Amino acid sequence: IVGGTASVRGEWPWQVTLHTTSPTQRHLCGGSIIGNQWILTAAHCFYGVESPKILRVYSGILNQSEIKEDTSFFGVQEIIIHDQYKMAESGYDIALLKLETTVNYTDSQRPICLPSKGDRNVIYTDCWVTGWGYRKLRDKIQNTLQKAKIPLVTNEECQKRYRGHKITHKMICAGYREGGKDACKGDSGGPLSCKHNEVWHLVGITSWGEGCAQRERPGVYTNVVEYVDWILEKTQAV
């Protein structure tokens, strides 16, 4: 996250850090708790990941330094990638991780509400992007979870900023016309959370952009409302 600040412990209880074990243990991508055995993340985070066996999900983490070999985590039983996914820039940058065990909800770890089918009409004014990603271009994974308040922008306005690309309605953009605040490398899969009627909702999933936090280049997110049926299909399967 560029131009944001250190989070407070327990501020984003749905935020997870998705780690890989092979080659070495490290943070791979963000994610969100959406069910007691479900993580909503981005499909591009699995490029080259040949097995769910090398994955570890950590919830209730503020600092990456909290994670050692003795730290409790959730194993990944199944990686569910949208079957229309080709690449981040073309859309369908969404995936579901079925966890091996149940997440027991606490004040440190609980789920974020998915948007409503009637919430297509709503205008969100308080949207925040969070993650352990880069705060600058050539950087490293951050220790402390970072946060930034970013305004949502219309599809038409986002299309004007992305000549040569096709901003689909399954995409949602957020950014300041002068830049300065955005998600960056390492933040993918993580949430774009909007508070509406004192209720937080998972509006977006960090996906792509042109560099990070540049002027007239708002970050592109997976538009969660447009995937509620797909999510229910995968999670509520008989």
Ligand X SMILES: C[C@]1(c2ccccc2)C[C@@H](c2cccc(-c3ccc(C(N)=O)cc3C(=O)O)c2)Nc2ccc(C(=N)N)cc21
227 annotated as ligand-binding: no
53 annotated as ligand-binding: no
Query: Of 7, 188, 193, 207, which residue is the catalytic one?
Result: 188
Shortest gap between Cβ of 30 and ligand X (angstroms)? 8
Closer residue to ligand X, CB minimum distance, 9 or 185:
185
Query: Rule CB under 6 A: which residues touch ligand X?
Result: 27-29, 44-45, 133, 141, 182-188, 206-209, 211-212, 219
64: phi then psi, degrees, rounded to nearest 5: -60, -25
Segments of 62-170 assigned E as strands: 74-81, 95-99, 126-131, 146-149, 152-153
Shortest gap between Cβ of 5 and ligand X (angstroms)? 17
Closer residue to ligand X, CB minimum distance, 120 or 140:
140
Give yes or no for a contact between 42 and 209, defined as CB atoms under 8 angstroms apart.
no
HEC assignment per residue over 6-44: ECCCCCCCCEEEEEECCCCCEEEEEEEEEECCEEEECHH
The count of residues in the chain is: 238
Shortest gap between Cβ of 133 and ligand X (angstroms)? 6
Closer residue to ligand X, CB minimum distance, 112 or 183:
183
Q: How far apart are CA 79 and CA 39, in angstroms?
A: 10
Distance, CA of 46 to chain centre: 14
Shortest gap between Cβ of 73 and ligand X (angstroms)? 16
Tell me if residue 44 is catalytic: yes
Which residue reads 């997110």 in tokens? Answer: 221
161 annotated as ligand-binding: yes
Q: Which uninterrupted H or E stretch holds 5?
A: strand 5-6
105 annotated as ligand-binding: no
Closer residue to ligand X, CB minimum distance, 27 or 170:
27
Query: Of 19, 27, 44, 201, which residue is the catalytic one?
Result: 44
| Catalytic residue annotation | 44, 93, 188
Binding residues: 160-163
Binding residues for heparin: 160-163
